[PDB]
Amino acid sequence: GKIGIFFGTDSGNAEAIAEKISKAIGNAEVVDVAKASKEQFNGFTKVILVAPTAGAGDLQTDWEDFLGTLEASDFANKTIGLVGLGDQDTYSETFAEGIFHIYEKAKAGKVVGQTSTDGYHFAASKAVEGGKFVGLVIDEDNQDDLTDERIAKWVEQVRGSFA
């Protein structure tokens, strides 16, 4: 209920991921950003932002438009978790960068869930700050076989940060 998990998708991967996190974290509400509003968004104090990476490393359409109506002040009082989707093989130099764009404003609040870069193969990605991943990264086009465990470990790590 209280944990707002906002996602945006084109194919459906993100939606499916958001759903898997909800079940694994519990006490959560999945919300498609394409229908979300600023008012609804601020109704939560804890949020998990799952966003797929569009061409060039930019945000999926739904997300870019929703994010544009948000300022840093809106993230200030929240605890935030970022989950990005990407294709590390086809896009070695833009791997899951969408998240980074959300990060530009989300850094105003309390961000948690930074992940190690071990187990990935790519060239560049703004999503990496301090030799670490700004949040959880998922690859459904190349590493679908590692998702279920990654979400599990992530939920474990960040679990305590949410309540």
Residue keyed to tokens 């309540």: 163
Compute the least distance from the CB of residue 87 to ligand FMN, in Å.
4
29 close to 5: Cβ distance less than 8 angstroms: yes
Residue found under tokens 């544009």: 68
Residues 124-153: x where in contact with ligand FMN by CB under 6 A, - otherwise, as a string: ----------------xx------------
Choose, by CB under 6 A, the member of 9, 79, 143, 147 that binds ligand FMN.
Answer: 9
Of 21, 28, 52, 135, the one binding ligand FMN (CB under 6 A) is 52
| Residue 86 binding ligand FMN, by CB under 6 A | yes
Torsion of CA 138, 140, 141, 144, to 10 degrees: 110
Residues 6 or more apart from 46 whose CB is under 8 A from it?
2, 3, 4, 78, 79, 162, 163
* Choices 64-72, 92-100, 103-111, 153-161; region in contact with ligand FMN by CB under 6 A: 92-100
- Whichever of 60 and 79 has its CB closer to ligand FMN, that residue is 60
23 token code pair: 């079940």
Q: Token digits for 30?
A: 């999945």
Displacement of CA 137 from its chain's centroid (Å): 8
Contact with ligand FMN (CB under 6 A) among 44, 75, 95, 120? 95
Candidate residues 1, 39, 55, 149; the one interacting with ligand FMN per rule CB under 6 A = 55
- Max Cα distance, the chain (Å): 39
Which residues lie near ligand FMN (CB under 6 A)?
9-14, 52-57, 60, 85-87, 91, 94-96, 140-141
